[PDB]
Amino acid sequence: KILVELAQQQDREIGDGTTSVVIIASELLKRANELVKNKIHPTTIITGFRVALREAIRFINEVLSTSVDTLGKETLINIA
Amino acid sequence: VPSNATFKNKEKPQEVRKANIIAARSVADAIRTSLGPKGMDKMI
């Protein structure tokens, strides 16, 4: 029911991405199933995902592109 | 030395107290894994 409520959640904030949020959240748990067999405690697994996330959000803000682009808009048509 | 003083009767309370301790320690074993910062959550 967590991913069921997570898919219903994604519509509330952004409104789009219900397909990508479920696959990513299911893959984070899938690969973590082999990490617990290593005896690694989840707090180490959670910290490894959070420290990598803090650097991931900052990396996305560095690679973003401005909406100016060329003279004309040429954006909102491609956004839809 | 034996055969004198008194002899213990109705020993069931001795077993009842053991059954209560074993049943109580079994509950304390599930919550034991949640102790400390390394503890885990329990979903019910």
JSON list of C-alpha atoms in Angstrom, two decimals:
[
{"chain": "A", "resi": 1, "resn": "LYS", "atom": "CA", "xyz": [0.00, 0.00, 0.00]},
{"chain": "A", "resi": 2, "resn": "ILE", "atom": "CA", "xyz": [3.00, 2.35, 0.26]},
{"chain": "A", "resi": 3, "resn": "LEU", "atom": "CA", "xyz": [3.53, 2.52, -3.50]},
{"chain": "A", "resi": 4, "resn": "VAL", "atom": "CA", "xyz": [-0.25, 2.65, -3.95]},
{"chain": "A", "resi": 5, "resn": "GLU", "atom": "CA", "xyz": [-0.37, 5.80, -1.82]},
{"chain": "A", "resi": 6, "resn": "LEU", "atom": "CA", "xyz": [2.86, 7.03, -3.43]},
{"chain": "A", "resi": 7, "resn": "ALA", "atom": "CA", "xyz": [1.34, 6.86, -6.92]},
{"chain": "A", "resi": 8, "resn": "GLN", "atom": "CA", "xyz": [-1.71, 8.73, -5.63]},
{"chain": "A", "resi": 9, "resn": "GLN", "atom": "CA", "xyz": [0.65, 11.23, -3.99]},
{"chain": "A", "resi": 10, "resn": "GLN", "atom": "CA", "xyz": [2.64, 12.06, -7.14]},
{"chain": "A", "resi": 11, "resn": "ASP", "atom": "CA", "xyz": [-0.56, 13.47, -8.66]},
{"chain": "A", "resi": 12, "resn": "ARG", "atom": "CA", "xyz": [-0.97, 15.89, -5.75]},
{"chain": "A", "resi": 13, "resn": "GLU", "atom": "CA", "xyz": [2.39, 17.71, -5.79]},
{"chain": "A", "resi": 14, "resn": "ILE", "atom": "CA", "xyz": [3.76, 17.59, -9.34]},
{"chain": "A", "resi": 15, "resn": "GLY", "atom": "CA", "xyz": [0.83, 15.91, -11.09]},
{"chain": "A", "resi": 16, "resn": "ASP", "atom": "CA", "xyz": [3.11, 13.96, -13.45]},
{"chain": "A", "resi": 17, "resn": "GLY", "atom": "CA", "xyz": [5.68, 11.23, -12.92]},
{"chain": "A", "resi": 18, "resn": "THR", "atom": "CA", "xyz": [3.47, 8.56, -11.33]},
{"chain": "A", "resi": 19, "resn": "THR", "atom": "CA", "xyz": [5.11, 6.04, -13.68]},
{"chain": "A", "resi": 20, "resn": "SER", "atom": "CA", "xyz": [8.72, 6.98, -12.86]},
{"chain": "A", "resi": 21, "resn": "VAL", "atom": "CA", "xyz": [8.25, 7.32, -9.09]},
{"chain": "A", "resi": 22, "resn": "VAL", "atom": "CA", "xyz": [7.01, 3.74, -8.69]},
{"chain": "A", "resi": 23, "resn": "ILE", "atom": "CA", "xyz": [9.74, 2.11, -10.78]},
{"chain": "A", "resi": 24, "resn": "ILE", "atom": "CA", "xyz": [12.55, 3.99, -9.02]},
{"chain": "A", "resi": 25, "resn": "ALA", "atom": "CA", "xyz": [11.16, 3.30, -5.55]},
{"chain": "A", "resi": 26, "resn": "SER", "atom": "CA", "xyz": [10.77, -0.39, -6.42]},
{"chain": "A", "resi": 27, "resn": "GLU", "atom": "CA", "xyz": [14.34, -0.60, -7.75]},
{"chain": "A", "resi": 28, "resn": "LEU", "atom": "CA", "xyz": [15.85, 1.03, -4.64]},
{"chain": "A", "resi": 29, "resn": "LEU", "atom": "CA", "xyz": [14.32, -1.79, -2.59]},
{"chain": "A", "resi": 30, "resn": "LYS", "atom": "CA", "xyz": [15.22, -4.51, -5.12]},
{"chain": "A", "resi": 31, "resn": "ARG", "atom": "CA", "xyz": [18.96, -3.76, -5.10]},
{"chain": "A", "resi": 32, "resn": "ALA", "atom": "CA", "xyz": [18.86, -3.22, -1.32]},
{"chain": "A", "resi": 33, "resn": "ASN", "atom": "CA", "xyz": [17.72, -6.84, -0.87]},
{"chain": "A", "resi": 34, "resn": "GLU", "atom": "CA", "xyz": [21.25, -8.00, -1.72]},
{"chain": "A", "resi": 35, "resn": "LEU", "atom": "CA", "xyz": [22.76, -5.31, 0.53]},
{"chain": "A", "resi": 36, "resn": "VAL", "atom": "CA", "xyz": [21.13, -6.68, 3.69]},
{"chain": "A", "resi": 37, "resn": "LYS", "atom": "CA", "xyz": [22.63, -10.10, 2.92]},
{"chain": "A", "resi": 38, "resn": "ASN", "atom": "CA", "xyz": [26.02, -8.40, 3.41]},
{"chain": "A", "resi": 39, "resn": "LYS", "atom": "CA", "xyz": [24.85, -7.84, 7.05]},
{"chain": "A", "resi": 40, "resn": "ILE", "atom": "CA", "xyz": [25.04, -4.08, 6.35]},
{"chain": "A", "resi": 41, "resn": "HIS", "atom": "CA", "xyz": [22.63, -2.37, 8.72]},
{"chain": "A", "resi": 42, "resn": "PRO", "atom": "CA", "xyz": [19.82, -0.39, 7.02]},
{"chain": "A", "resi": 43, "resn": "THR", "atom": "CA", "xyz": [21.00, 2.84, 8.67]},
{"chain": "A", "resi": 44, "resn": "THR", "atom": "CA", "xyz": [24.19, 2.48, 6.64]},
{"chain": "A", "resi": 45, "resn": "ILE", "atom": "CA", "xyz": [22.08, 1.71, 3.56]},
{"chain": "A", "resi": 46, "resn": "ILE", "atom": "CA", "xyz": [19.76, 4.65, 4.27]},
{"chain": "A", "resi": 47, "resn": "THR", "atom": "CA", "xyz": [22.68, 7.01, 4.88]},
{"chain": "A", "resi": 48, "resn": "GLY", "atom": "CA", "xyz": [24.29, 5.84, 1.64]},
{"chain": "A", "resi": 49, "resn": "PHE", "atom": "CA", "xyz": [21.12, 6.73, -0.26]},
{"chain": "A", "resi": 50, "resn": "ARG", "atom": "CA", "xyz": [20.64, 10.06, 1.52]},
{"chain": "A", "resi": 51, "resn": "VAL", "atom": "CA", "xyz": [24.23, 11.30, 1.12]},
{"chain": "A", "resi": 52, "resn": "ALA", "atom": "CA", "xyz": [24.05, 10.33, -2.56]},
{"chain": "A", "resi": 53, "resn": "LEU", "atom": "CA", "xyz": [20.70, 12.13, -2.83]},
{"chain": "A", "resi": 54, "resn": "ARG", "atom": "CA", "xyz": [21.99, 15.37, -1.30]},
{"chain": "A", "resi": 55, "resn": "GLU", "atom": "CA", "xyz": [24.71, 15.45, -3.97]},
{"chain": "A", "resi": 56, "resn": "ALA", "atom": "CA", "xyz": [22.22, 14.39, -6.66]},
{"chain": "A", "resi": 57, "resn": "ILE", "atom": "CA", "xyz": [19.84, 17.30, -6.05]},
{"chain": "A", "resi": 58, "resn": "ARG", "atom": "CA", "xyz": [22.76, 19.73, -6.18]},
{"chain": "A", "resi": 59, "resn": "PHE", "atom": "CA", "xyz": [24.03, 18.14, -9.40]},
{"chain": "A", "resi": 60, "resn": "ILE", "atom": "CA", "xyz": [20.63, 18.56, -11.07]},
{"chain": "A", "resi": 61, "resn": "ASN", "atom": "CA", "xyz": [20.65, 22.29, -10.26]},
{"chain": "A", "resi": 62, "resn": "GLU", "atom": "CA", "xyz": [24.08, 22.60, -11.90]},
{"chain": "A", "resi": 63, "resn": "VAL", "atom": "CA", "xyz": [23.08, 20.90, -15.18]},
{"chain": "A", "resi": 64, "resn": "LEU", "atom": "CA", "xyz": [19.77, 22.74, -15.67]},
{"chain": "A", "resi": 65, "resn": "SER", "atom": "CA", "xyz": [19.19, 24.93, -18.72]},
{"chain": "A", "resi": 66, "resn": "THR", "atom": "CA", "xyz": [17.58, 28.36, -18.83]},
{"chain": "A", "resi": 67, "resn": "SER", "atom": "CA", "xyz": [14.22, 28.94, -20.49]},
{"chain": "A", "resi": 68, "resn": "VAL", "atom": "CA", "xyz": [15.64, 31.76, -22.67]},
{"chain": "A", "resi": 69, "resn": "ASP", "atom": "CA", "xyz": [17.25, 29.50, -25.31]},
{"chain": "A", "resi": 70, "resn": "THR", "atom": "CA", "xyz": [16.74, 31.15, -28.74]},
{"chain": "A", "resi": 71, "resn": "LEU", "atom": "CA", "xyz": [14.87, 34.37, -29.59]},
{"chain": "A", "resi": 72, "resn": "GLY", "atom": "CA", "xyz": [11.40, 32.84, -29.71]},
{"chain": "A", "resi": 73, "resn": "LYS", "atom": "CA", "xyz": [9.93, 30.68, -26.98]},
{"chain": "A", "resi": 74, "resn": "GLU", "atom": "CA", "xyz": [10.45, 27.22, -28.52]},
{"chain": "A", "resi": 75, "resn": "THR", "atom": "CA", "xyz": [9.84, 25.70, -25.08]},
{"chain": "A", "resi": 76, "resn": "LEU", "atom": "CA", "xyz": [6.18, 25.41, -24.04]},
{"chain": "A", "resi": 77, "resn": "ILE", "atom": "CA", "xyz": [5.44, 23.67, -27.35]},
{"chain": "A", "resi": 78, "resn": "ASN", "atom": "CA", "xyz": [8.14, 21.10, -26.57]},
{"chain": "A", "resi": 79, "resn": "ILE", "atom": "CA", "xyz": [7.11, 20.85, -22.90]},
{"chain": "A", "resi": 80, "resn": "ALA", "atom": "CA", "xyz": [3.68, 19.45, -23.80]},
{"chain": "B", "resi": 1, "resn": "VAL", "atom": "CA", "xyz": [19.13, -34.85, 57.69]},
{"chain": "B", "resi": 2, "resn": "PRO", "atom": "CA", "xyz": [16.35, -35.54, 55.12]},
{"chain": "B", "resi": 3, "resn": "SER", "atom": "CA", "xyz": [12.91, -37.01, 55.97]},
{"chain": "B", "resi": 4, "resn": "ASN", "atom": "CA", "xyz": [12.55, -34.21, 58.56]},
{"chain": "B", "resi": 5, "resn": "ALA", "atom": "CA", "xyz": [11.30, -30.60, 58.59]},
{"chain": "B", "resi": 6, "resn": "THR", "atom": "CA", "xyz": [8.76, -30.24, 55.74]},
{"chain": "B", "resi": 7, "resn": "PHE", "atom": "CA", "xyz": [8.24, -31.53, 52.20]},
{"chain": "B", "resi": 8, "resn": "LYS", "atom": "CA", "xyz": [7.20, -29.34, 49.28]},
{"chain": "B", "resi": 9, "resn": "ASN", "atom": "CA", "xyz": [3.67, -29.97, 48.01]},
{"chain": "B", "resi": 10, "resn": "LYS", "atom": "CA", "xyz": [1.58, -28.61, 45.12]},
{"chain": "B", "resi": 11, "resn": "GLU", "atom": "CA", "xyz": [4.57, -27.88, 42.86]},
{"chain": "B", "resi": 12, "resn": "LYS", "atom": "CA", "xyz": [2.39, -26.53, 40.03]},
{"chain": "B", "resi": 13, "resn": "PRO", "atom": "CA", "xyz": [3.10, -22.88, 41.06]},
{"chain": "B", "resi": 14, "resn": "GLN", "atom": "CA", "xyz": [6.78, -23.66, 40.47]},
{"chain": "B", "resi": 15, "resn": "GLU", "atom": "CA", "xyz": [5.86, -24.58, 36.89]},
{"chain": "B", "resi": 16, "resn": "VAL", "atom": "CA", "xyz": [3.39, -21.69, 36.53]},
{"chain": "B", "resi": 17, "resn": "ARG", "atom": "CA", "xyz": [6.09, -19.17, 37.44]},
{"chain": "B", "resi": 18, "resn": "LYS", "atom": "CA", "xyz": [8.40, -20.76, 34.85]},
{"chain": "B", "resi": 19, "resn": "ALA", "atom": "CA", "xyz": [5.67, -20.63, 32.20]},
{"chain": "B", "resi": 20, "resn": "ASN", "atom": "CA", "xyz": [5.13, -16.94, 32.97]},
{"chain": "B", "resi": 21, "resn": "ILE", "atom": "CA", "xyz": [8.83, -16.07, 32.72]},
{"chain": "B", "resi": 22, "resn": "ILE", "atom": "CA", "xyz": [9.35, -17.98, 29.46]},
{"chain": "B", "resi": 23, "resn": "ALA", "atom": "CA", "xyz": [6.28, -16.36, 27.91]},
{"chain": "B", "resi": 24, "resn": "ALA", "atom": "CA", "xyz": [7.41, -12.91, 29.06]},
{"chain": "B", "resi": 25, "resn": "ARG", "atom": "CA", "xyz": [10.97, -13.33, 27.76]},
{"chain": "B", "resi": 26, "resn": "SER", "atom": "CA", "xyz": [9.57, -14.42, 24.38]},
{"chain": "B", "resi": 27, "resn": "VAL", "atom": "CA", "xyz": [7.82, -11.05, 24.04]},
{"chain": "B", "resi": 28, "resn": "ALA", "atom": "CA", "xyz": [10.97, -9.21, 25.14]},
{"chain": "B", "resi": 29, "resn": "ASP", "atom": "CA", "xyz": [12.95, -10.90, 22.34]},
{"chain": "B", "resi": 30, "resn": "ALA", "atom": "CA", "xyz": [10.94, -9.29, 19.53]},
{"chain": "B", "resi": 31, "resn": "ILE", "atom": "CA", "xyz": [11.25, -5.79, 21.01]},
{"chain": "B", "resi": 32, "resn": "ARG", "atom": "CA", "xyz": [14.95, -6.37, 21.76]},
{"chain": "B", "resi": 33, "resn": "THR", "atom": "CA", "xyz": [15.84, -5.94, 18.07]},
{"chain": "B", "resi": 34, "resn": "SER", "atom": "CA", "xyz": [14.46, -2.37, 18.20]},
{"chain": "B", "resi": 35, "resn": "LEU", "atom": "CA", "xyz": [16.80, -1.20, 20.99]},
{"chain": "B", "resi": 36, "resn": "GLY", "atom": "CA", "xyz": [19.43, 1.43, 20.26]},
{"chain": "B", "resi": 37, "resn": "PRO", "atom": "CA", "xyz": [20.07, 3.54, 17.17]},
{"chain": "B", "resi": 38, "resn": "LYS", "atom": "CA", "xyz": [20.51, 0.29, 15.21]},
{"chain": "B", "resi": 39, "resn": "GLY", "atom": "CA", "xyz": [16.98, -0.83, 16.06]},
{"chain": "B", "resi": 40, "resn": "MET", "atom": "CA", "xyz": [14.35, -1.47, 13.41]},
{"chain": "B", "resi": 41, "resn": "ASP", "atom": "CA", "xyz": [10.71, -0.47, 13.18]},
{"chain": "B", "resi": 42, "resn": "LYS", "atom": "CA", "xyz": [7.90, -2.96, 13.82]},
{"chain": "B", "resi": 43, "resn": "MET", "atom": "CA", "xyz": [4.96, -2.90, 11.40]},
{"chain": "B", "resi": 44, "resn": "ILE", "atom": "CA", "xyz": [1.69, -4.15, 12.91]}
]
